[PDB]
Amino acid sequence: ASIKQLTLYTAELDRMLAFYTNMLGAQHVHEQADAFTIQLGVSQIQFRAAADGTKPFYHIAINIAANHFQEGKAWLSGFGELLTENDEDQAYFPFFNAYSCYVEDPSGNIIELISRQQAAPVLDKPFSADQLLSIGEINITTSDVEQAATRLKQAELPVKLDQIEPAGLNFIGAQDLFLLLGPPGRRWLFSERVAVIYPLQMELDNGVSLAITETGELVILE
Ligand SMILES: Cn1ncnc2c(=O)n(C)c(=O)nc1-2
Ligand SMILES: [Mn+2]
């Protein structure tokens, strides 16, 4: 399964627009009324203006070819200081057998480039903005982890209920797509920001559609 559409909010719509227009190219970013969309391979993200008094941010990982990590890292570093953790500007996660690259955007989103060494294809050609494959990860920060895992399982997603941990982060998915299901509070790696509940909507490849309210409740829309 893949993310076809992702709806996120932002308190820096104008700055966000310029940032991504400069990063992805005018041919991948469409400005709309009080919102704009960006194209990331087979995935699309619409950023909508956030409600006053709030400054939403999320953790978004973008898939890139197994052999494009170094190039992706260099490309990403041209748009912002690369984030570090343990004084390292990149990380290797053995569970996903992937290398990841991080940068913060104007609204404080943790933008990540993830290169899956075996779960992503090898593209014998130069990396470029046009080479972003799709959304590989998105955080589902909920006020009730067990309830979300349940409804997600009901939505027919790969879920091991007896393995879900309410107080921690839980990887839900397979192949090149994982939902980072967890509670608010914990600091995000490569970031000063701690997990906080913010609304969002998501439409998957299989027609499944779900949203997270401002309360943090996960609810299957479709
Ligand atoms: C546990 N874990 N595994 C993989 N990737 C991450 C990650 O990107 N971030 C931001 C995070 O807080 N935790 C992670
Ligand atoms: Mn990640």
What tokens appear for 68 in the block?
Answer: 């494009």
At 77, give phi and psi (nearest 5°): -70, -10
Q: Look at residue 147 and give its three-state secondary structure.
A: helix
Q: Whose CA is nearest to atom 2 of ligand 1?
A: 189
Using a 6 Å cutoff on CB, does residue 119 contact ligand 1? no
Resolution of the coordinates, Å: 2.0
| Residue 51 vs residues 8, 29, 107, 144: alpha-carbon distances, Å | 12, 22, 13, 23
Q: Give residues whose Cβ lies within 5 Å of ion ligand 2.
A: 61, 112, 137
CATH topology of domain 1-222: 2,3-Dihydroxybiphenyl 1,2-Dioxygenase; domain 1 (3.10.180)
How far is 187 from 92, CA to CA, in rounded Å? Answer: 19
Nearest C-alpha to atom 9 of ligand 1 is from which residue? Answer: 189
Cα(31) to centroid(ligand 1), Å: 31
Ligand 1 center–CA 184 separation, angstroms: 14
Beta strands in the chain (DSSP E): 3-10, 29-32, 35-40, 43-49, 59-64, 91-93, 98-104, 110-116, 134-141, 170-174, 177-182, 200-204, 209-212, 218-220
Q: How was this structure obtained?
A: X-ray
DSSP string covering 21-76 = HHHH-GGGEEEETTEEEEEETTEEEEEEEPPTT-----EEEEEE-TT-HHHHHHHH
How far is CA 110 from each of CA 98, 113, 157, 208, rounded to the nearest angstrom? Answer: 17, 10, 25, 25
Residue 52, judged by CB atoms within 10 A of its CB (0-12, 13-18, 19+), counts as: exposed
Provide φ and ψ at 79, rounded to 5°. Answer: -115, 0
- Domains in the chain: boundaries: 1-222
